Symmetry: C5
Subunit: 278 residues, 5 copies
């Protein structure tokens, strides 16, 4: 398990696996009906605001959460372990944001004309590949936020106690593991840099309200997953963990400026090799 030896050679010593992770912006995949809520799939529901400085209770379907998948690798067996060497990853569908013919708040609000305002604002892109769940560190805007006690994993879920003022900075007690898809809000749970020895993660954030969204995509870019010692994530029990979130901004409706988060799916193609371990 611990001591890393030579690369295994011979038939089937290398494998490639691919997966797509759909975004988890708030509306679940079901109901599928385009008149019963399914029309919001790929988006959050309308963001609901605090009613006072002491009453902030966001609905679960307004909170983007981490996407995750655990993939099973070919059975193995000094022992052998699968080692993640590299990944090609791509966020797909930015071209869909060129739809400016819909019924969003129009650019000319005097005549109700122009174009349907495209998705704009705060953007958040993180992906990770590891041999165990992504380790998470909690940190919130407001320790007083009344997150729901059902259907979501928050700091109180883990500690069994209300949040404290330290949860607005780094409180080492407030940790979790990304072990469920669509359950851990991204405004609460961050990659833990004090752990994640067996995972590589890459994140970026751009804020603002009207910020132009930016994205690049190509099938020619490889992300190396080997550490400073030439060792990739080692997959415990032949399980490979993929984690991501890809927020593009908000669309804004014609009714009291209601905002809906927009997310996009992420492709992963991971190259793995067998590694001798002791």
């Amino acid at each position: 398990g611990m001591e890393v030896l030579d690369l295994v050679t011979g038939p089937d010593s290398v494998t490639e696996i691919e997966a797509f992770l759909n975004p988890r912006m708030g509306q679940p995949p079901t109901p599928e009906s385009l008149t019963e809520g399914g029309q919001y799939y790929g988006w959050s529901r309308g963001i609901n605001l605090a009613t006072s400085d002491t009453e902030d209770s966001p609905e679960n379907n307004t909170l983007p959460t981490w996407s995750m998948a655990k993939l099973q690798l070919p059975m193995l067996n000094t022992l052998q372990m699968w080692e993640a060497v590299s990944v090609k990853t791509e966020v797909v569908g930015s071209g869909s944001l060129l739809d400016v013919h819909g019924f969003n708040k129009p650019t000319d609000t005097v005549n109700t004309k122009g174009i349907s305002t495209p998705v704009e604002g705060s953007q958040y892109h993180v992906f990770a590949v590891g041999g165990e769940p992504l380790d998470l560190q909690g940190l919130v805007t407001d320790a007083r936020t009344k997150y729901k006690e059902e259907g979501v994993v928050t700091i109180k879920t883990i500690t069994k106690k209300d949040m404290v003022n330290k949860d607005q900075v780094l409180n080492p007690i407030s940790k979790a593991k990304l072990d469920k898809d669509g359950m851990y809000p991204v405004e609460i749970w961050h990659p833990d840099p004090a752990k994640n020895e067996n995972t590589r993660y890459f994140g970026n954030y751009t804020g603002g309200t009207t910020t132009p969204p930016v994205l690049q995509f190509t099938n020619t870019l490889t992300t190396v997953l080997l550490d400073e010692n030439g060792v990739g994530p080692l997959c415990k029990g032949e399980g490979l963990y993929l984690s991501c979130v890809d927020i593009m901004g908000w669309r804004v409706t014609r009714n009291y400026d209601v905002h809906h988060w927009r997310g996009l799916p992420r492709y992963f193609k991971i190259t793995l090799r067998k590694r001798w371990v002791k």
Copy 2:
């Protein structure tokens, strides 16, 4: 030929081919008359907006589509195939956007003075070179969008069924191939990262409504098309596929802020070599 062998040497073992792909923003090349619609060539027609949350019917000539060309390579036939090594590509005509003396919405709307507002807003630049058609993955803003059944290839064209809520995220069923110029809307069809083993594509997106357009151009830049194994796209049946879209933003008229998409043509110069295959 699946197995890639040595490079072919001797007379005419290397070739160089060039092409330009004109943009397909909505107005077709004909009619040519500058009073009958030809004056909009290089642009879309005026973007028409949804009339309700459930009534979004964009006209075909308001939707930018993929440009594509299939080029015939010198005849050949252990067999030989043409291998695309590199490409020099350039978007031509950004200097034309320095025309601020026209009849667009003026910069001083109070007095109808200043300059004619230049093209601004959302921008989209993708090119691809491959030995078969570019593989496409469908993904839309709104699965309820009522695209025309004739004159465009959309998800319904492929599936023979209405779009589903999954089409707003990644639905593996919604796939196509870029086999026709000016027919596949870019707000629907994206490069499929799960396929395109024999094509290289490079894309970028910048959104917003008044975003400054940015472009670089030079005859000194070479894009390598060789993969991680040193193998370029292999041209099946001696056909080379070029695909692109180059949206610079919109111009805005003096009449109810009507927007017209602006596109620019793309130059390709591809270097190819003969490769032994079996």
Copy 3:
């Protein structure tokens, strides 16, 4: 030891230490109460403005200060010294800025709708690793600013005299050392480039009032601390000094646009090796 010799080899000759430094934006860690002030931890209190050109008296809890920590390394004693080779550092919690459901100034102020305006504006990111306290150089916007005498270390604290007009530019008399956490205002005290021979510091500033905050984070980036001669900071008396400030911008309230600074915590993982010295 001033003369640097060979690296020490053998058992325990290399060590790794980690720490997090919480931000010091103005509100202290106590009281912890989420009603009596603890709700502002990780933030400043409401920024108070000058009442005239000659009356600028900022409150201590409105002034972000440097974070610092002195870490004790393993006992060592031609002598040996600990040498800081490299650091992996990360600013944690940018995802928490995606909370736009609170009670900040809303994006639609006419109807009190839209979203809770996220953190925006001036940003400041500096970190340092050294074998002694970070050397500081004073420089202020206004030498007339009346800082509190107690509770902050300012130029007057050091000189025992009022600031002079030269303190608005570079005055070599106005120097200090970063020897206390949460005490040295970042609008006064800057890394001194004329000293810090035994410290590496890295800073950036982005100004403005509504500027989108930008942050990257990954566990794959290593910052080398070796100088041009291959020598890292040497830890005097086995003490390692970490210093930082990470301002993301301000939040704005619904009452007279009151601004509160937002800061985020910084993780450090330092690799050290024993060095022979004479």
Copy 4:
């Protein structure tokens, strides 16, 4: 001089030539008088707008044109040719844009106060070095634009016929050579990527109306002119061609927001070597 052989060695086998090209924004160098039009030298005259969708008649002195110069090299004549190896090029005078004390549209228009608004907006920087005139490809915003017949070289000058709708995209008929300084409008004529085998060009465009101008300048940067085969432009008949345009944006007056283009001069220092040719 088709087959390129060895480099020539010996006395005077390498040479350096320098030149500055002044901008050609619309006002000619004469009259010199600062009351008769000379005050506009370095700028365009006030941009005049179309009066309808079918009446766009820009005046020649409102249209920036390409700068060019043909330089004579030392006499030479297996023959020898001058080969351009590299160029150091710089745009001079960006500091002059720090003049915000003039009579431009003020930053506070409510009270007519503040500062004189500095040059802002669309920017266009292109330079070329070659052994023959820069090859130009025509492309316009509007094929209906009524350019003057005398005083500018436009598409009609070349074809002897009105522009066609194809001229709004890539029309290979619409070609020219940059053989005159201050005559070819940059909104019409672009470097032709299908030609220019013996010229290197480098261009960039940034659009918008109030975009901050950006410029870097240093005497430490060398641009290599050698192609992929290590051969620079070969100077036919010992003539070296320099081409450029450097638009910084517009100034805006206090009278009906009249805009004037601003251009800056470009320095070139070219290193050339003698090459044996057959």
Copy 5:
């Protein structure tokens, strides 16, 4: 001058440091914080033209180049010797200090809430200009102005007219090779007039950048880990003529805006230089 081998031995390499304070318009004196000294590090309030033909900026509203000449140790007892030694500038660590001070948003500038006169004191924003140079002789300057009609003061600033003894011509709005000078005095050459001359400066390295606009966010990086190489393409750094080393800079961060008629004041910051020099044999 033929450049030969590097000199070896005791004291063949040296490091020297200096800070250059900004020259935004208000001189260092008077020092009093009620008599004008409160503006040191800033310009005085920018005064505007009163017509298209009447543009008379005051000297204290015009940022000028900072410069310093440093004298290095004498190397040659006898200049008639066939082979001599010169100081060669190899590299420089340079840093603009004090961007953190722009985080003061608690002052009496134009406030961000103009309805209630609340919010924050608007931070420094707008046009930015960063140039530094290191050379073995003064920085060569090329004149180029926005307006050849600008009526600069004849005393207190070095302008094109100072040099030519004649009024500016329309050519001075583009490149006029007649309009040249050398940066031989601190706080005297306006940066809206005088630019590094790319046709000279063979013995100087300069690095400049400009970002315009009115409300543009200021951006700055600072670190003690970044070395700027001064060696040319042939491996030779600036050679110090008569052992003189020239440092030149300007670092404009933008303007602050007051509560009285949006009066703007330029803000500048000081720049640190640490130059590594070595002795070089020459003939």
